[PDB]
Amino acid sequence: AKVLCVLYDDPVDGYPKTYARDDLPKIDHYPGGQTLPTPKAIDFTPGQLLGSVSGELGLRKYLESNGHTLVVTSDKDGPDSVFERELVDADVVISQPFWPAYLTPERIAKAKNLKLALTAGIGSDHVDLQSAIDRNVTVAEVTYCNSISVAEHVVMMILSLVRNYLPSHEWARKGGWNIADCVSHAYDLEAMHVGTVAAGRIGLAVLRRLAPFDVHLHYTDRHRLPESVEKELNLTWHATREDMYPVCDVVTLNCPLHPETEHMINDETLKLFKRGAYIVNTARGKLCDRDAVARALESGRLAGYAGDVWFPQPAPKDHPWRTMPYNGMTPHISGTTLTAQARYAAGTREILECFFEGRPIRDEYLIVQGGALA
Amino acid sequence: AKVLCVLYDDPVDGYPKTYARDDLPKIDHYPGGQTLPTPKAIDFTPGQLLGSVSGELGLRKYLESNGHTLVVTSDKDGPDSVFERELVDADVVISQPFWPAYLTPERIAKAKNLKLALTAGIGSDHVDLQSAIDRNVTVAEVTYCNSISVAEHVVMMILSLVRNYLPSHEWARKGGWNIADCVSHAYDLEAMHVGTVAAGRIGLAVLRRLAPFDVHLHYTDRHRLPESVEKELNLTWHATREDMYPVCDVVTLNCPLHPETEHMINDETLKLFKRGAYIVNTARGKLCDRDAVARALESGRLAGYAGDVWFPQPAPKDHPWRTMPYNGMTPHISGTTLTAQARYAAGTREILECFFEGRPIRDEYLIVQGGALA
Numbered sequence A, B: 001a002k003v004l005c006v007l008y009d010d011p012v013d014g015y016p017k018t019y020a021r022d023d024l025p026k027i028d029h030y031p032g033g034q035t036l037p038t039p040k041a042i043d044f045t046p047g048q049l050l051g052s053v054s055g056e057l058g059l060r061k062y063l064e065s066n067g068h069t070l071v072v073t074s075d076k077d078g079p080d081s082v083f084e085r086e087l088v089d090a091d092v093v094i095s096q097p098f099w100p101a102y103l104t105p106e107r108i109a110k111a112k113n114l115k116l117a118l119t120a121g122i123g124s125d126h127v128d129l130q131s132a133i134d135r136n137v138t139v140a141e142v143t144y145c146n147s148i149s150v151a152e153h154v155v156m157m158i159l160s161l162v163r164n165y166l167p168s169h170e171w172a173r174k175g176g177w178n179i180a181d182c183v184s185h186a187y188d189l190e191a192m193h194v195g196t197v198a199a200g201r202i203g204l205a206v207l208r209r210l211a212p213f214d215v216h217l218h219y220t221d222r223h224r225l226p227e228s229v230e231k232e233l234n235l236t237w238h239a240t241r242e243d244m245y246p247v248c249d250v251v252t253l254n255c256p257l258h259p260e261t262e263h264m265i266n267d268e269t270l271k272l273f274k275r276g277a278y279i280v281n282t283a284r285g286k287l288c289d290r291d292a293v294a295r296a297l298e299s300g301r302l303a304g305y306a307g308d309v310w311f312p313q314p315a316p317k318d319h320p321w322r323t324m325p326y327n328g329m330t331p332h333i334s335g336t337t338l339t340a341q342a343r344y345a346a347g348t349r350e351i352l353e354c355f356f357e358g359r360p361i362r363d364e365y366l367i368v369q370g371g372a373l374a
Helices: A060-065 A082-087 A105-110 A129-134 A147-162 A165-173 A179-183 A201-213 A227-232 A241-247 A290-299 A338-357 B060-064 B082-087 B105-110 B129-134 B147-162 B165-173 B179-183 B201-213 B227-233 B241-247 B290-298 B338-357
Strands: A002-006 A069-073 A092-095 A116-119 A138-141 A193-197 A216-220 A250-253 A277-281 A302-307 A366-369 B002-006 B069-073 B092-095 B116-119 B138-141 B193-197 B216-220 B250-253 B277-281 B302-307 B366-369
Touching: A002 A082, A060 A069, A060 A338, A069 A082, A082 A105, A092 A338, A105 A129, A116 A338, A129 A138, A129 A366, A147 A165, A147 A201, A147 A250, A147 A277, A147 A302, A147 B147, A165 A179, A193 A201, A193 A241, A201 A216, A201 B201, A216 A241, A290 A302, B002 B082, B060 B069, B060 B338, B069 B082, B082 B105, B092 B338, B105 B129, B116 B338, B129 B138, B129 B366, B147 B165, B147 B201, B147 B250, B147 B277, B147 B302, B165 B179, B193 B201, B193 B241, B201 B216, B201 B227, B216 B241, B290 B302
Parallel strands: A002 A069, A002 A092, A092 A116, A116 A138, A193 A216, A193 A250, A250 A277, A277 A302, B002 B069, B002 B092, B092 B116, B116 B138, B193 B216, B193 B250, B250 B277, B277 B302
Antiparallel strands: A138 A366, B138 B366
């Protein structure tokens, strides 16, 4: 069969030959008990760059050994892309959320041998699930592969914003000292109130990690967490998110983007936050009105904003979030650390082997399976 | 009496007229039970910049309304300095560890009226303790005032180094995207081996904060912690520093600088660290041989180094740590956030009121009292 795999570009100076470390930490399961990916074998060394075009998710040898074809490209935007071009007869499509190959209804329609749409990561927002359901395309993802990676990024950014790390580092790097210039916008995180919009795998991991900082934890979600979890973390529930904002010094967004949540942070809802509040958003760029956020930082309503998700993405070279005051942005990378890559590359292989040997794909990985949401 | 108070310079754009937020979070005690400072009154608003020359630790009104003189300066180095000139007849000398007025044997000998040497912060290594003992000078500090502040800075820097945040932020800032350039030196912290050299107020506050990150915790110290604490954090004890190094992914230094620990991190001991380890040092700059650390980063043996302490301080504009690869440095600021400042300006006032009224200074604040170390 034919596997069409869309990956991001290699580094500026080439594909790395040498890495900072020899191995990766051993983990057996994810919080809650889900086990880590269980492929029959892997043809990469954990820690190597796997999500770039030269890493190939460590799949070529396995695929070619069972007489399958592996097409790897980074060109996936438009009708004239390699991806569109190769889609027609690909049996399997693989892409990561970090450089996604959108499976529009149109493409799904022209995708004649398409049986499996695999997300090497988490998050199939780039896929049209109705069309896959109708056309009987199985949609799978490597559940939990990077939830912890994202939660780490969130806590890092909260600390960095509150403590004014980025500006302080600049003074050091540029030959300065200027203690008062660093600390006139620096606070401790201890005892501040922090709230999460949604408490799913990432939101819960974030709350767990913040607890020992002796912050007061708040959350809002579609449904409340089990009472014992609320008790263990001393959580304060908010039935509406607009009720949670005014009492929080820090708000982290960990919810999906829907029409209901598009632009949920705008000039109007920003007026509900306390003066000097901080926002961290590693969820979707468009949860926030780009200009509303920029205005809040320029004016001082907000004391910091950080995340790794933007709109549009890739972000334009002049996107105002790159240079607005008190930002802690990064490009879209939180779930594509070398560590997270080793898990989703292994997960990707495990699913392929299942699909090819006729075995069932773990239920946890399945999104759309055979005419329906599974 | 005459109070000589050495503080750091105001911000380059002047003393702030405005701040990012309106108030500070409420805390009643430090971990273990110690209460926060209890002066009879304060003449500042918590959240203002107090550690710089125009802040004056919020002390002038109190001192001048009681017939005392307050001399505030940042000029403290050498014999022609305002500090050296005024020291001859000062009754009390106050300075912070971030901009320390050194009380060498020679200066103590010249300070004829010296009765109280107060550290507005923690750590009195800028004071010759034997000379103070020999001259009956009381040496006090505001115990616990920024231990949590430092601990938060340590965890922030650990996360930042491991996840390669600083270089990722620069790609964003500069108009790039470059996912693979950001992640080819990016890992998750989860399940790494983290060790602390000493487990004092700061070291233990660091351990507690790292636990939920699901790291494996290690420590070494002069004495072992109680078995209950060891069992609650699942700590692995190492009797020596050299025994601990080789099993750790991240090493944080939270111990004092003595002849014994001076240059404890050097070309030889660095050979014991695993390839790609990280070091965080918010203790003292001289615990590390400056050039051996630079060389380890340059040669790829070490994957990152961060801290806020340097040798010497202020660091010369060409100090190698400013620009060595994979550094996460800041000027010496961890314990001087606006929040920490409010606690040590309040404790400074508490201590002075006790001193001037002949009431005993709290036992936990005393370093040297009545010709002996307390």
